[PDB]
Structures are given as structure tokens and as C-alpha cells.
Design a protein around this ligand. Structure first.
Ligand SMILES: *CC(=O)N(c1ccc(OC)c(Cl)c1)[C@H](C(=O)NCCc1ccccc1)c1cccs1
Length: 166
């Protein structure tokens, strides 16, 4: 639709988790979140999953949460079913939140992703297009986008930004 344009927080959105159940993202109010588009057959799948698991293990007790959205739009590198992707993520000992596969670009992009991309200046992205697998957004406790990190930036580079938002 168009109402996503008017939102001011991630917490105004909902999304289906990887089991198919709708999740209201306002449950993340009060938590610092990394939101990322993931893929199982990407050249950087291992480094992204393992470092995201490591960050979550290290900072969940501080309030860090991670929202992973599978997306097949980049080299068709997430071709499997939601059940297969859940089983894949389990292989990296993922304990953060897996969502159902979505689009992140184009007219059928999930509204949360349409919204994140238009956030200002250094928060949202340039060109209204996610470029590849494993773009990361840092979301503060109020659900606002505070930083983004591109497909080639390892998740551990986010660690230096976390203390300003916990
Ligand atoms: C979990 C947590 O939030 N930590 C922390 C506090 C404040 C900030 O920045 C505002 C950040 Cl990034 C993290 C832990 C932490 O507090 N570790 C110390 C453990 C402890 C031991 C005894 C009593 C109380 C706390 C941090 C993780 C890395 C650096 S600080």
C-alpha cells in the first residue's frame, strides 16, 4: 500500500515469522535490533551467520535482538522453502528471530523494508534498492534506523556502534 511511508518506527510494522505466524514488531520496543536480509547460498553466508550468532550470544543479555529476513532477489541465493531455511539457520546455532522469506526491493517489497530504505541520510540507503544479500540496519530502542551496513561489511563492524544505543 502506501501507509508505510507515514510510519516513524519499526514498531508500527508486522511480519510473518519463519513458521508462518504474524509477529507484531512492537515487541522489540526497548531493544536494540539488527535487521538483515539473509541468503543460504551466498559467498558471505558463513561469515554473516556466524558473526550474527556471535553478536547475539554476546549481547542478548544487554538487549540486542536480531531479525533475519530471507530474500531470494540476489543471485537467487535463497531458493529454498521457509522450512528448509529454518533448518539451515539451525545449523549455525541461530537463536535470534527468523522470518518468512520476503522481497526487499520493488513493488512487492515488505513494507518494513520499504520504510527502512527511505529513512534519512546515513540511516536509510541510497537509490531505494538493497544491493545484495546481507545488508544490515541498526535499529534503536525506539524503532528508528540509526545506521546501515552494506553487503560486504562483516556484522562484527556493528559492534563498535552498539554502546551508544543500549
Ligand atoms: C550487557 C551490557 O549492556 N553491557 C553494556 C553496558 C553498557 C553499554 O553501553 C552503554 C554496553 Cl555496549 C554494554 C556489558 C557489561 O555491562 N559488561 C560488564 C559485566 C558486569 C559485571 C559486573 C557487574 C555489572 C556488569 C558490556 C559488554 C561489552 C562492554 S560492556
Amino acid at each position: 500500500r502506501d501507509d508505510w511511508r507515514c510510519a516513524r518506527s519499526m514498531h508500527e510494522f508486522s511480519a510473518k515469522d519463519i513458521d508462518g505466524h504474524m509477529v507484531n514488531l512492537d515487541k522489540y520496543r526497548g531493544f536494540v535490533c539488527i535487521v538483515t536480509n539473509v541468503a543460504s547460498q551466498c559467498g558471505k553466508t558463513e561469515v554473516n551467520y556466524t558473526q550474527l550468532v556471535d553478536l547475539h550470544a554476546r549481547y542478548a543479555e544487554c538487549g540486542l535482538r536480531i531479525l533475519a529476513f530471507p530474500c531470494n532477489q540476489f543471485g537467487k541465493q535463497e531458493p529454498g522453502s521457509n522450512e528448509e531455511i529454518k533448518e539451515f539457520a539451525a545449523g549455525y546455532n541461530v537463536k535470534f528471530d527468523m522470518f518468512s522469506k520476503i522481497c526487499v526491493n520493488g513493488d512487492d517489497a515488505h513494507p518494513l523494508w520499504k520504510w527502512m530504505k527511505i529513512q534519512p541520510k546515513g540511516k536509510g540507503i541510497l537509490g531505494n534498492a538493497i544491493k545484495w544479500n546481507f545488508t544490515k540496519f541498526l535499529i534503536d530502542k525506539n524503532g528508528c534506523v540509526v545506521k546501515h551496513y552494506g553487503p560486504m561489511e562483516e556484522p562484527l563492524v556493528i559492534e563498535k556502534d552498539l554502546p551508544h544505543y543500549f
